[PDB]
Design a protein around this ligand. Structure first.
Ligand SMILES: OC[C@H]1CNC[C@@H](O)[C@@H]1O
Ligand SMILES: [Ca+2]
Ligand SMILES: [Ca+2]
Lengths: 761, 762
């Protein structure tokens, strides 16, 4: 079957196809149809596109703060620009093109166009274009471009490097220096802020006879190939674009030239990329039985998560990946809570490396905490190269007055720290990797524990500790006390810290305590807090108050009615005076997020009552929200409702359902957290996969829209394949060598000794 | 020496005279020339004026919250409305009238108008009118209205009760019930929120022969008096307006009738009122020698504070007094900090009664604290009858969008509470009234310390207590930590509590400890706070940081430059996103306010450096501001600057230098804190009067604009008269039973003991 939406289809469940051109959606399409490989993102634009169509190659570890405010990745010269003129007429996409198809091939990250258009001289031109960012050679993105006419004609093919590229917050590169080489052009420039060196090398190759002349100017370089096309005789241009910076290698210019020198042909490079992708999908593919739309959407999200994940160096997964510069190519809490689970269970070394990135940027967290008068590690809200805070104090404008507003993402949204500590401990429970904990995880958890202890306030008349003046996952509400989510996360951290102290061997403990100056007095403080911290809990109707006083704010159900108070659509809705501030309308899961992370902590009736309470109060105006509600709905017998949220989360980018711009800030691009959560929705949500103590849990649910699903999950080195249909679950232990496991299925103990177990439901 | 400013003069230094009618200044003229007596305020309007001219009579203890949001005093039917017609033509002030003067006579709280205008039929009519609110008979305001023609002519005088009165936040009275009685009309109504009964009675007397005809409509009642005026023969109308509510007496309609019955003529009632005023002025007058402008401004200010102060019942001094409904007829911190000092030193029973008001409303402070998750006494920001918070969460609007903004005046501005414990202790030190402390004060101070201990946070890794997320006297900065003023006030309270714990008799201490459930755990928390609370102190430059991180906000000097960033003039300047928020611009005294309250705490050089640092960062956009800078400047050798601030301060109402309106809320009216502060600038400021333990201090300074000043202050029961001239200070003990006193003068020496000493001021 094939109809996904708009004018979008899939033929194989591995491909997304868009069969009408619409200039207005350029941007959503450049994001949705992009390619990349963790090193770069190349937007899915056409060969003749420049800044006006939002062409961009975003490159990791090119951070730059040219405008004095926003530190973000650089967009680099585009070595693939290719314009076609036919008898002096430019070939420009018409919404009435005789014939247009665009395809993203998820199985191998190859993005393509096939288009035919009648020119003014009467010739019909067909262009076949395809591009991929090599997963084998991370520094290379490659193009094959084929033009054919149905009529003998004069044409000009103009190809080169465009320096005049889209950059959201200023040009990041200056002092461009042209150079040539045996197969094409080069340019080397330096970054504006830190004067890092960036080189882009173009290779060029044309399989037809032509009059070629070069040109160089301040805006780009390239060459013009003058041809007569013969009717029905195709001409093919192959290109490679290669990027290196001094943050990658000592000599980027030469290393880029050396890369060019050893480049194979397009087809050979594509073959090797495909091998890489075969291996990627054998780790990550999740099958949904008999629902090809949902199968492709899931794969579209997973693919985006993959190409956004750096694996070549210790780098963050950006909250908009490498799709554009939005969100600064930087790690948010999204990285651990939304993007890490798929890796954790499917390829744990990547999860381990996510956390090693956080160990490596601990000094940045230490500087932020110190600068704000705390101790320990207060991780950055927005974390780039070093872990120093990239989130400005002034993220948004009040679009009514034109004045900056001050939001506290960067200094009151403290849960980022114990979120990380939570992820360390999960990584440990899932994998059994004690070494990670000894060499890295204990130091992190101890420093995060120390931070919590320096933030908390002790209230002597109440005899308890509290967490005042924070911002929780529901972004809209700032300056709240005892956010339930935050207090729970803080307690989890302290409990983990105490376990480690009582559980590590004395030589590890001594080395760690010594490294960070951990004293007996700090440890007593922690254990006093363990026993005496206020933690919001279910009240008499079973409801956990989201923060102190939340119950006193205006009830608005359905939440969305609050939009009637807006004066401009692009207002920021939250602090300090947005329409939601004095209301119980929340942006996204908050109390519900707590159950996603601690699914065994509250009984199912409590979860259910909180879901019923909070969901109608929830705007879902963050891409992170629907997946979190889906995961919880699935496990409290709200399976169809979970499915509808699944649908909302998986289509966020494909069907273009969010806003691009808010409070004068651009917030669009590919939704990486959602991309990552697509997997969790199937595996932890419907499947109900969790690891509690050394207990493994499954509670498979199934929406009516699907006949089944099947996924892989690795626990403690054992690879389990879980197959779920309407009447049964089967768990099979692949694993070169099996150890036995005890599983809890719908709460009942069952031993997976042997290879396989089947149970009804 | 005539000229104050606008078109304002004084003739004797006891009167304010305005000689141009200015319709556009209605709000200001009506406040400035009001009358009152602490039970009501009656705005300085003309007898023909109504709602459109902002006529109003504001009556204490008639609180009402008709709009669901603002609990304010009622304006009540106006029993003085009087329109004149002359051969059918109504008499209406024209800005261009043959001649006009209005006069407020401060010696006896009598406001008046004289006006002539030529009418269409060629007659020139002159109206002399005058009113006072009786200080002998607090429920009565009286009018004498005289009319004369230079030409025989028919006329009609229409007088009665206007129901259709100015109210800021909706109609507060309903169910108006018309009645008649021998000497005129009556109307009884009920209040909307609490259904208290309010009656107004009108008495009326005309000394000419006239044909009289009553009317009653749903907007009011009255009578026309048809007359035939003779050239040069005046006709006089006398009225009394009498008001009682069910909050004053069980039977207000009967009690109003009874007062009507025993009302003497206007002249008799005026003589009795003059007598009370003789007595008031002999308690409060402060002389300024050879500067009649400053002399009259001073008196204008003290007159306003006196009439704003209820002395008939345990009620608050409002922050706009009874001049209009603005600020709710209610006690702010202004009451203790700005209005009490004159009473403390001139008539301490009023100072005692102010504190008894705070004691009486302890339960409201206890409800507020409990409502917000605290313990003890969190006194209301805006306090009315019971002590419950009357300040809304949404006080102001963002005028750029029309939406409400939330300001935390009501639940982060915590200093109100230690301000009151401050005031209890100062009252104790000045009077020696140990009984007050035993029966009222100790309980208050204890509850306020218990509040502060529930507010404080302990920071275990810093090993100290802090006061987080407050708002200081500088209203513009909200959500600040460790406001200096606040933490110093909190320490002062904890210290007064610990002194009581250590010095009251066992019996009194047990009764108080038991009444409030004061445990020993609480008491060691207080002592632990005293040794371990963070208190911002002078830094290496001598500067005390206003609140944590204040030094990191934008420097703008002079502060007023910030106003260039305004999009509208009437935007609220402060929190959440006003022009001052991220700047060091402050609304009023804050660190400087601390020196005002604790003038012996830090040395002179520290005070000086803080003055120089903070003054140019200060907008002075609060009427509280200049008096506090005056008082400090005076005493660190900035006497002429002190005197400029004195001038800004005493002219605030007279010269109408402030706004009326800000962020969609009406904040105009008479500036009662400034009124009170006028006294302190002279006495505490130039005079340097303070009490430090058992030490009486004086440091008299003299600005160039004055040849001298003279004032009285009472300290530990002894009435001292202090005369200041260029070269000497004369102190005479005017007590009926003299007892000897120490006295430091410029930090030295003297034991008074004897009727009169003269020291060199050199
Ligand atoms: O006048 C009463 C209040 C007005 N706002 C600033 C406060 O300092 C003051 O008490
Ligand atoms: Ca819903
Ligand atoms: Ca100044």
């Amino acid at each position: 079957m094939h109809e996904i939406g708009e004018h979008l289809t899939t033929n194989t469940g591995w491909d997304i196809i868009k069969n009408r051109y619409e200039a207005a959606q350029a941007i959503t399409e450049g994001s949705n149809f992009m390619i990349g490989n963790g090193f770069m993102g190349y937007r899915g634009t056409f060969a003749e596109d420049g800044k006006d169509a939002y062409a961009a190659c975003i490159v990791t570890d090119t951070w730059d703060k040219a405008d004095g405010k926003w530190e973000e990745l650089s967009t680099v010269p585009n070595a693939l620009l290719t314009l076609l003129h036919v008898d002096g007429e430019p070939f420009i996409m018409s919404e009435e093109a005789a014939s247009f198809e665009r395809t993203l091939d998820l199985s191998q990250g190859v993005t393509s166009r096939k288009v035919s258009q009648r020119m003014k001289n009467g010739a019909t031109i067909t262009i076949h274009e395809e591009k991929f960012a090599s997963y084998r050679k991370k520094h290379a993105v490659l193009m094959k471009y084929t033009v054919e006419s149905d009529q003998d004609t004069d044409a000009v093919l103009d190809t080169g490097i465009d320096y005049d590229v889209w950059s959201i917050n200023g040009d990041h590169l200056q002092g461009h220096h042209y150079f040539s080489h045996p197969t094409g052009d080069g340019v080397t420039a330096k970054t504006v802020s830190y004067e890092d060196t960036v080189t882009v090398v173009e290779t060029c190759s044309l399989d037809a006879d032509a009059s070629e002349e070069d040109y160089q100017n301040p805006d780009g370089s390239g060459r013009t190939f003058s041809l007569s096309l013969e009717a029905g005789k195709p001409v093919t241009l192959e290109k490679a674009m290669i990027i290196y910076s001094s943050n990658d290698v000592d000599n980027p210019q030469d290393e880029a030239l050396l890369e060019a020198k050893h480049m194979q042909s397009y087809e050979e490079e594509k073959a090797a990329n495909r091998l890489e992708w075969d291996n990627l999908w054998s780790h990550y593919d999740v099958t949904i039985q008999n629902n090809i739309i949902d199968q492709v959407a899931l794969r579209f999200n997973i693919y985006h998560a993959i190409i956004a994940t750096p694996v070549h160096k210790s780098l963050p997964i950006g909250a908009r990946g490498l799709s554009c510069q939005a969100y600064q190519g930087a790690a948010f809490w999204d990285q651990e809570i939304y993007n890490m689970p798929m890796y954790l269970y499917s390829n744990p070394e990547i999860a381990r490396n996510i956390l090693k990135y956080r160990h490596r940027t601990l000094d940045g967290a230490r500087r932020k905490a110190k600068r704000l008068g705390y101790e320990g590690a207060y991780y950055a809200w927005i974390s780039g190269k070093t872990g120093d805070e990239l989130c400005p104090d002034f993220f948004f404008k009040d679009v009514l007055s034109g004045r900056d507003i001050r939001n506290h993402f960067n200094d009151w949204q403290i849960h980022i720290s114990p979120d990380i500590a939570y992820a360390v401990k999960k990584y440990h429970q899932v994998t059994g990797d004690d070494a990670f904990i000894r060499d890295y995880g204990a130091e992190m958890i101890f420093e995060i524990a120390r931070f919590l202890a320096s933030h908390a306030v002790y209230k002597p008349m109440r005899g308890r500790y509290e967490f005042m003046r924070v911002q929780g996952p529901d972004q809209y509400h700032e300056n709240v006390d005892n956010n339930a989510f935050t207090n729970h996360q803080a307690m989890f951290t302290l409990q983990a810290a105490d376990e480690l102290l009582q559980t590590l061997d004395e030589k590890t403990l001594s080395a760690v305590k010594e490294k960070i100056g951990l004293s007996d007095d700090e440890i007593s403080l922690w254990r006093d807090m363990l026993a005496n911290t206020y933690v919001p809990k279910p009240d008499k109707h079973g409801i956990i108050e989201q923060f102190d006083g939340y119950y006193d704010l205006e009830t608005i159900i359905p939440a969305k009615k609050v939009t009637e108070r807006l004066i401009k659509e692009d207002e920021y809705y939250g602090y300090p005076n947005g329409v939601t501030v004095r209301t119980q309308c929340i942006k996204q899961a908050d109390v519900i997020q707590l159950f996603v992370l601690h699914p065994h902590l509250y009984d199912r009736k409590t979860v259910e009552l909180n879901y019923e309470f909070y969901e109608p109060r929830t705007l879902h105006f963050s891409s992170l929200s629907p997946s979190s509600y889906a995961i919880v709905a699935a496990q409290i017998d709200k399976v169809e409702e979970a499915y509808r949220n699944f649908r909302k989360s998986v289509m966020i980018d494909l069907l273009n359902t969010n806003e691009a711009v808010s409070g004068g800030t651009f917030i669009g691009g590919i939704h990486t957290a959602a991309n990552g959560a697509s997997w969790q929705m199937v595996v932890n949500g419907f499947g109900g996969l969790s690891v509690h103590g050394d207990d493994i849990h499954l509670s498979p649910r199934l929406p009516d829209a699907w006949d089944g699903y099947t996924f892989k999950a690795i626990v403690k080195g054992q690879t389990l394949e879980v197959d779920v249909t309407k009447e049964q679950i089967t768990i099979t232990n692949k694993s070169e060598d099996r150890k036995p496991l005890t599983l809890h299925i719908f709460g009942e103990k069952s031993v997976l000794d042997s290879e396989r177990i089947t149970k009804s439901r």
